[PDB]
Structure 1
Amino acid sequence: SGFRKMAFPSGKVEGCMVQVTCGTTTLNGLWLDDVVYCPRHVICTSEDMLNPNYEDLLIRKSNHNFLVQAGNVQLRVIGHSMQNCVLKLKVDTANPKTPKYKFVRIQPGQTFSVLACYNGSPSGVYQCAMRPNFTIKGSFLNGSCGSVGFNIDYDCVSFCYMHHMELPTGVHAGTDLEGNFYGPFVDRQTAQAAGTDTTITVNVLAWLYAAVINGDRWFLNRFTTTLNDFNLVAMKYNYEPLTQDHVDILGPLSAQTGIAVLDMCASLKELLQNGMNGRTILGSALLEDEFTPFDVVRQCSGVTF
């Protein structure tokens, strides 16, 4: 028993991280097969970031201007191209540690692990969720760009995020591995403010199921509700609307615990209206929303990789 904010084992991704330097800018790249993926603003100086024309800045770059370093060994770049907001650097050596992998574009509310890196070296690993406003609340310092977010399915790494920028409010924005930003954000040092960071209702409900499974139950009440009535309450509290799709996804957790989904919604509704009254749930004094129903099933059953 016990429930922790848990990231995937990072070894498979550690073996993919390299350093990319262009001029005086150094960040991280992802080395899969004979291609290194990195943010395209590696070609930018701090000056260029104010208003970059990436196509023009790229005319001035050749393969040999991209210094790729794997540990203590330099990689030979034999080609480069820009795809949306990432560069793909073709190298003459296939990464011998390439895992089985996929590129996936996740939806808001979905979770993933981040391997924070600096100069191509792994610094730490932590769990994140794509927020409803398409930011993530990560831990990134200057030099962490190119760090990736990922999920693992047994032996297949699904890369879903590459870090690119920090907004003035300290939240973070990035792309999928095809170089498309999540949300409306751009790799340009300008005014771009995040929208409302609503709470991921389906994840809160899954985490309440995790609590019940682990013995925290003071919050279970004598009530039930309906989707429409609950969402009226969820709206007032800046909670995402709960759909029947979400209800269906929570089915297995409902079956395991014998608590109907709408009953747990009624318990959540009271928690929102009454508050925690100084109590905690799984060691938290606020309702956690960065565990998916799949994360809960995974951690409560012992899935491995």
Structure 2
Amino acid sequence: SGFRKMAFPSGKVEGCMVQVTCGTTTLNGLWLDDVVYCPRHVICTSEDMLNPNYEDLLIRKSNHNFLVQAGNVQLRVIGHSMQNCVLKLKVDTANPKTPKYKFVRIQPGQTFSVLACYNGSPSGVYQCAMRPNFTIKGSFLNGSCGSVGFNIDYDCVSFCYMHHMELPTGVHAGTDLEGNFYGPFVDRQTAQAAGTDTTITVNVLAWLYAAVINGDRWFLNRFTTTLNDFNLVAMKYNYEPLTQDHVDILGPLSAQTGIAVLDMCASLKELLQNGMNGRTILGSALLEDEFTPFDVVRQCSGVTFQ
């Protein structure tokens, strides 16, 4: 037993991480087969970053301007192209450590692991959720751009995020691996703002089930509620609406604990209207929303990755 915010083992992604330097900008790239992917704002100077025309900036670049550094081995760049907000640097060596992989785009409310990197060297791994407002609450310092987010399915790495920038509230924005931003953000050094967030209701319910599985039961009650009457309460506390598909997805956790989904909704309703009154749930004094139903089932059942 126990419940921890758990990242995927990072070894398969560590073997893909390289350093990309152009001019005075150094960031991280992702090396898969003979392509290195990295944020296109590597081609910018300090005054380029204010309102850049990236097509103009890129035509003025040469293959030899891009220094790609894989550990202590230099990778010769033999082609370059831009795809949306990422650069694809074609190199003369295929990465012998390339795992089986996919480029997937995730939905708000879904989670992934982030391998934070600096100078092509991995620094730490941690779990993130895509917020409803398409930001992530990460841990990123200067030089972290090009660090990626991912999930692992059995032996396959599904890359879903590449890091590009920090917003004024200290949250983070980036792209999928096709270079398309999550949310209404642009890779320009201009004033942008996250936009209002909401709490991921289905994830909070999943975490309440994790708690019950682990022996925290004090928030349970005999009461029940209808889905419509729960969603009236959710709206008022800035929670996302709960759909019948969310109820369906929570089915297995409901069956394992013997607590009906709508009964757990009644419990959540009381927690929202009363607070916790000095008690904790799974070591937290807040309702936690960055665990999906899948994350709960995985951890409270023990799936591995080969």
In the TM superposition, 1:112-127 aligns within 5 A as: 112-127=112-127
1:304 aligns with 2:304: yes
Distance 2:262 2:77 in 1: 56
Q: Which moved more, 1:69-78 or 1:190-199?
A: 190-199
In the alignment, structure 2 segments of 5+ residues that lack a partner are: none
Residue aligning to 1:6 = 6
RMSD: 0.6
SS in 2 for 1:301: coil
SS in 1 for 2:4: coil
SS in 1 for 2:117: strand
Distance 1:35 1:2 in 2: 41
Distance 1:232 1:194 in 2: 25
How big is the shift at 1:63?
1.0
Deviations 1:185-217 (A, max 9, x none): 000111211111110000000000000000011
How big is the shift at 1:299?
0.4
SS in 2 for 1:222: coil
Distance 1:196 1:231 in 2: 19
How big is the shift at 1:153?
0.6
How big is the shift at 1:103?
0.4
Distance 1:83 1:38 in 2: 10
SS in 1 for 2:234: helix
Residue aligning to 1:143 = 143
SS in 1 for 2:300: helix
Deviations 1:130-160 (A, max 9, x none): 0000000000001000000000011000000
Distance 1:66 1:249 in 2: 46
Q: Which moved more, 1:67-76 or 1:221-230?
A: 221-230
Report runs of 4+ in structure 1 exceeding 6 Å deviation. none
How big is the shift at 1:40?
0.2
Residue aligning to 1:291 = 291
How big is the shift at 1:60?
1.2
How many percent identity over aligned positions?
100
Distance 1:265 1:100 in 2: 40
SS in 1 for 2:18: strand
In the TM superposition, 1:84-163 aligns within 5 A as: 84-163=84-163
Residue aligning to 2:267 = 267
Distance 1:161 1:46 in 2: 25
1:218 aligns with 2:218: yes
Distance 2:94 2:69 in 1: 14
SS in 2 for 1:253: helix
Residue aligning to 2:23 = 23
Distance 1:245 1:89 in 2: 41
Distance 1:290 1:195 in 2: 19
Q: Which moved more, 1:216-225 or 1:133-142?
A: 216-225
SS in 2 for 1:234: helix
SS in 1 for 2:3: coil
1:280 aligns with 2:280: yes
Residue aligning to 1:206 = 206
How big is the shift at 1:19?
0.2
Deviations 1:19-77 (A, max 9, x none): 00011100000001111000000001222111111011111111111110000000011
SS in 2 for 1:125: strand
How big is the shift at 1:169?
1.1
SS in 2 for 1:296: helix
- Aligned pair count reads 305
Distance 1:121 1:255 in 2: 44
SS in 1 for 2:127: strand
Deviations 1:74-133 (A, max 9, x none): 001111110000001111111010001000000000000000000000000000000000
In the alignment, structure 1 segments of 5+ residues that lack a partner are: none
SS in 1 for 2:192: coil
Normalising by structure 2, what TM-score? 0.99
Deviations 1:217-247 (A, max 9, x none): 1001121111111111111111111111111
Distance 2:45 2:268 in 1: 48
